[PDB]
C-alpha cells in the first residue's frame, strides 16, 4: 500500500500549503512612500508667493487670458495651496524667518525671489515625481493587501475575521463529489482556494477507506469532512490547527514569489493534468487508493500560464507585483524627498548670499 496515500504522504505539500495559509489575516506593514519632500516644496512655494508682488498675490481656475495657459493650469492648484496656507496665523512670518527675509527691504525681497526661480526649476521635476509615486502606489496599503490574501486563502473580501467556509472556499460552494470539488484551472474551477487546496489535500472522508493525517500524523482528526466534503469544516479546522507558518515581516514580493514558485516546483504532471497531493488513480476523492489532491484539469507543462489564473495564484501574485513596484518606489521617494528638504534649505539661504 505504499503507493496508496498513507499517514504524512502530504507532509512536505502541507508545509508549503501552510506558509500560504498564514497570508490570511495578514496585519503587515507595507514600504511607505516618504511624502516628506511634497511638503518642503510646499513651503518653497509659500516663501515665493510670499516674496511675491502685491499684483501677483492679488490672483489667489486661473484669472481671464491664462485659462489655456498651461503652465498656469498646471501651477494653479500649487499657488492656491499655498495662498491658503500663507493665511494661516503668523505663517507668513515664519516662512520669512525662516528665510532670512524678516523685516527685508523691498530690493532683497526682489532679488531672492529671483534667485529661487533656477532652485523652484529644478525641484520641480523631483516633486513631480514625488507625487507620481505617491499616486501610482496609492492602493498598496496593508488593508488592500490583507482583503487580496483573504480572497486568496479563505475566498473572502475582507481585511480580517476570514473564516473557513465551503461556500467561499470552493468556487459555488463544493461540487456533487470531491472528485469534482477537488479541480481547479478548468472551466467548472472549484478549488480556487489556498483552503480549498488544503482540504483536498489533507481532508479525511468519511466511510472508511480515507487517508486520514496524510498532512502529518499530528492531526486530530477529531471528525471527518463528511460524504463528498459536505462537512469540511470542521475537519479544516483540525488541520489548520497544526499549522503555524508566520511570513516574513514587512511582507515583500520577494518572499510571495517563492512561495509561488516552490507550489510550482511540487507539481506533477501524468495522464495531462497537473496534481498537488499524492495522486494514484481515478481521481482526487479523498479515498487512500485514488487520490488526496488537488487536479489541475488539463495543466501541462507549456499551459502552466493557467496555473496562475487560478483565483488564488492571481491574488497572490497581484500583491507580488504592487510590492514589488512599491519596494522600488518606496526606496527611491526617500531620496527624493531628501533632496526636496535640502532644496528648501538652500532657498532658506539665499537672502544671506545676496545680503553680503
Ligand atoms: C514664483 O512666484 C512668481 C510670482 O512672483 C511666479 O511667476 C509667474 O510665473 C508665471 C508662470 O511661469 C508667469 O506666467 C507668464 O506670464 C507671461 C505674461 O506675464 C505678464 O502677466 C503676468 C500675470 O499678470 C505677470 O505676472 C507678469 O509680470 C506680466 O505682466 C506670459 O507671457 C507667459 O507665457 C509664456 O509661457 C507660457 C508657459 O506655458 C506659454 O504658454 C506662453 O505662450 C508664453 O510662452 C509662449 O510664448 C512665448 C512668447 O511670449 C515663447 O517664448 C514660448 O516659447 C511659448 O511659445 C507666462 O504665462 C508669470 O509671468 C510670473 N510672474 C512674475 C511676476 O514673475 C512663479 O511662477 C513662481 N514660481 C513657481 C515655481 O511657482
Ligand atoms: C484501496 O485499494 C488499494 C489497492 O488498490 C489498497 O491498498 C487500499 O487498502 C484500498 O483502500
Given at each position: ?147 487580496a490574501l ?13 473564516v ?10 463544493v ?27 489533507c ?9 486520514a ?112 513596484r ?6 527611491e ?18 537672502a544671506?548670499?545676496?545680503?553680503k
Amino acid at each position: 500500500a505504499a503507493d496508496d496515500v498513507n499517514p504524512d504522504d502530504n507532509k512536505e505539500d502541507f508545509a508549503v500549503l501552510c506558509a500560504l495559509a498564514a497570508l490570511a489575516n495578514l496585519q503587515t506593514t507595507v514600504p511607505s512612500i516618504d511624502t516628506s519632500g511634497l511638503a518642503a516644496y510646499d513651503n518653497l512655494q509659500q516663501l515665493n508667493l510670499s516674496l511675491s508682488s502685491k499684483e501677483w498675490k492679488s490672483l489667489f481656475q486661473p484669472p481671464e487670458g491664462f485659462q489655456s495657459d498651461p503652465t498656469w493650469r498646471k501651477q494653479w492648484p500649487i499657488w492656491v495651496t499655498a495662498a491658503a496656507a500663507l493665511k494661516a496665523e503668523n505663517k507668513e512670518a515664519a516662512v520669512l524667518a525662516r528665510a532670512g527675509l524678516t523685516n527685508a527691504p523691498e530690493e532683497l525681497r526682489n532679488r531672492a525671489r529671483l534667485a529661487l526661480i533656477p532652485l523652484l526649476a529644478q525641484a520641480e521635476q523631483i516633486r513631480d515625481r514625488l507625487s507620481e509615486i505617491q499616486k501610482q502606489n496609492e492602493d498598496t496599503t496593508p488593508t488592500a493587501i490583507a482583503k487580496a490574501l483573504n480572497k486568496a486563502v479563505y475566498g473572502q473580501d475582507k481585511e480580517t475575521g476570514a473564516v473557513y467556509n465551503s461556500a467561499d472556499c470552493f468556487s459555488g460552494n463544493v461540487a456533487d463529489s470531491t472528485q469534482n470539488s477537488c479541480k481547479a484551472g478548468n472551466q467548472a474551477s472549484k478549488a480556487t482556494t489556498v483552503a480549498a487546496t488544503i482540504v483536498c489535500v489533507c481532508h479525511k472522508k468519511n466511510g472508511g477507506n480515507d487517508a486520514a493525517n496524510a498532512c502529518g500524523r499530528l492531526i486530530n482528526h477529531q471528525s471527518d469532512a463528511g460524504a463528498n466534503l459536505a462537512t469540511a469544516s470542521s475537519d479544516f479546522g483540525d488541520i489548520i490547527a497544526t499549522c503555524a507558518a508566520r511570513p516574513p515581516k514587512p511582507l515583500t514580493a520577494a518572499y510571495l514569489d517563492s512561495a509561488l514558485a516552490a507550489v510550482s516546483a511540487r507539481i506533477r504532471f501524468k495522464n495531462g493534468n497537473g496534481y498537488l497531493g499524492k495522486f494514484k488513480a481515478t481521481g482526487c476523492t479523498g479515498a487512500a487508493s485514488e487520490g488526496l489532491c488537488v487536479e489541475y484539469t488539463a495543466l501541462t507543462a507549456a499551459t502552466m500560464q493557467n496555473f496562475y489564473k487560478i483565483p488564488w495564484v492571481k491574488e497572490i501574485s497581484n500583491v507580488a507585483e504592487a510590492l514589488k513596484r512599491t519596494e522600488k518606489d518606496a526606496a527611491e521617494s526617500t531620496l527624493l524627498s531628501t533632496w526636496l528638504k535640502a532644496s528648501e534649505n538652500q532657498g532658506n539661504s539665499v537672502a544671506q548670499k545676496l545680503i553680503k
